[PDB]
C-alpha cells in the first residue's frame, strides 16, 4: 500500500471529525495534532473567523473549491511543520463551521482533500522528515 497516505488520512480525518462530534505513530501524531492544533485555533480565532466569513462556505461545492486554494498555499515555497499544522488547523476550523451550518457530510471529503493536497504536494519532504514521527518530534 501507501503507508504515509494511510496514516495521514487517518490522523487528519479523525481530528476534523472530532471538531463536529491504530498504530503508535498515528496515536501519538493525533495526540500531538489535538494539542498543537487546538492551540493554533485558539490563537487564530479572530483571524480564522474573518477569512472563513469571506470564503462563504455553504455546501459541498464550496468545500470542493478549497482543494485548489490549498494547493496555492504551497506555491510560496514555504515547507515546514508550522505551515502544515496551521493548514490542517484551519481545515479543522472549517469542519467546525460545517457542523454549525448542518453540512457535516462535507467533513470527510474535506479531510480527504487536505490529505490529498498535502501528500501529493509534499510527499518527498514528508518522507525526508520521517513523516508523522517527524511531526511528533517537532512538536514535543
Contacts with ligand 5WL by CB under 6 A lie at 44, 47-48, 51, 54-55, 66, 68-70, 72-73, 76, 82-83, 86-87, 90-91, 94
Give the helix/strand (H/E) hosting 106: none
Query: Which of ligand 5WL, ligand 5WK, none does residue 29 bind to, with CB < 5 to 8 Å depending on kind?
Result: none
Q: Which of 23, 42, 53, 82 contacts ligand 5WK by CB under 6 A? A: 82
Is the CB of 50 or the CB of 82 nearer to ligand 5WK? 82
Residue 40 near ligand 5WK by CB under 6 A: yes
The C-alpha atoms of residue 135 and residue 132 are separated, in whole angstroms, by: 5
Cell of 76: 510560496
Question: Distance of CA 46 to CAs 42, 65, 85, 92, 118, Å?
Answer: 9, 23, 18, 15, 25
**Which of ligand 5WK, ligand 5WL, none does residue 136 bind (CB under 5 to 8 Å by kind)?**
none
Q: Does 8 bind ligand 5WK (CB under 6 A)?
A: no
Query: Nearest distance from residue 80's CB to ligand 5WK, in Å?
Result: 8
Contact residue for ligand 5WK among 2, 39, 53, 120 (CB under 6 A)? 39
Cβ neighbors of 100 (< 8 A, separation 6 or more) are none
CA distances 42 to 36, 64, 71, 100, 133, Å, are 10, 25, 24, 17, 25
CB of 114 to ligand 5WK, least distance (A): 16
Up-side HSE of residue 37: CA atoms within 13 Å toward CB? 27
Amino acid at each position: 500500500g501507501d503507508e504515509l497516505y494511510r496514516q495521514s488520512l487517518e490522523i487528519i480525518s479523525r481530528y476534523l471529525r472530532e471538531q463536529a462530534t491504530a498504530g503508535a505513530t498515528s496515536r501519538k501524531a493525533l495526540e500531538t495534532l489535538r494539542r498543537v492544533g487546538d492551540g493554533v485555533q485558539r490563537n487564530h480565532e479572530t483571524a480564522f473567523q474573518g477569512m472563513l466569513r469571506k470564503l462563504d462556505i455553504a455546501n459541498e461545492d464550496d468545500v470542493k473549491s478549497l482543494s485548489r486554494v490549498m494547493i496555492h498555499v504551497f506555491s510560496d515555497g514555504v515547507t515546514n511543520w508550522g505551515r502544515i499544522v496551521t493548514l490542517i488547523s484551519f481545515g479543522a476550523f472549517v469542519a467546525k463551521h460545517l457542523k454549525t451550518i448542518n453540512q457535516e457530510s462535507c467533513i470527510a471529503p474535506l479531510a480527504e482533500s487536505i490529505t490529498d493536497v498535502l501528500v501529493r504536494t509534499k510527499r518527498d519532504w514528508l518522507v525526508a522528515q520521517r513523516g508523522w514521527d517527524g511531526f511528533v518530534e517537532f512538536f514535543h
